[PDB]
Amino acid sequence: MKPPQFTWAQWFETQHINMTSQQCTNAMQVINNYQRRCKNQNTFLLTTFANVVNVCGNPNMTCPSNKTRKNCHHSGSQVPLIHCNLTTPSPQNISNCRYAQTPANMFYIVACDNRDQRRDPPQYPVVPVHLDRII
Ligand SMILES: Nc1ncnc2c1ncn2[C@@H]1O[C@H](COP(=O)(O)OP(=O)(O)O)[C@@H](O)[C@H]1O
Numbered sequence: 001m002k003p004p005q006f007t008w009a010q011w012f013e014t015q016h017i018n019m020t021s022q023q024c025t026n027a028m029q030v031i032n033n034y035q036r037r038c039k040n041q042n043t044f045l046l047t048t049f050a051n052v053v054n055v056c057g058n059p060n061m062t063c064p065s066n067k068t069r070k071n072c073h074h075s076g077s078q079v080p081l082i083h084c085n086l087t088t089p090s091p092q093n094i095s096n097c098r099y100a101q102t103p104a105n106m107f108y109i110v111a112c113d114n115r116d117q118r119r120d121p122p123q124y125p126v127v128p129v130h131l132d133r134i135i
Helices: 008-016 024-035 049-055
Strands: 041-045 072-074 079-088 098-106 108-114 126-134
Touching (some): 008 041, 008 126, 024 041, 024 079, 041 126
Antiparallel strands (some): 041 079, 072 108, 079 098, 108 126
């Protein structure tokens, strides 16, 4: 789920593009502090927001996760990425959650939609809103 101050595009960026630290335990604190819980796993794509926006321009395809959605797009090429896996749940005090990190170079599929009319900058009429899968 996402905090109210974020549009889907900004939340996508916060969760999958802006890895604030190369260490998952530190990077995941941002996501967990916003979601008020420790996300079991999360993928950080080591690419630019602009690159993802352009991927939104690639041919539409069915989303591997939801066979009813047709707003997904394949990256075309592989990109470096870090996958974070929760290793220490820490019931109370989510800042104590620890994660393992898995580096890899894979293709990705993202779902994109028109920008939030009121909050997203007009610069990008089309933006990624969900990471559907990595291959
Ligand atoms: N095809 C889709 N198009 C637009 N929005 C979607 C789509 N699929 C899922 N969503 C929404 O986007 C949210 C973002 O999920 P996300 O953070 O990307 O999941 P995770 O990173 O745990 O895989 C979902 O919880 C859902 O409400």
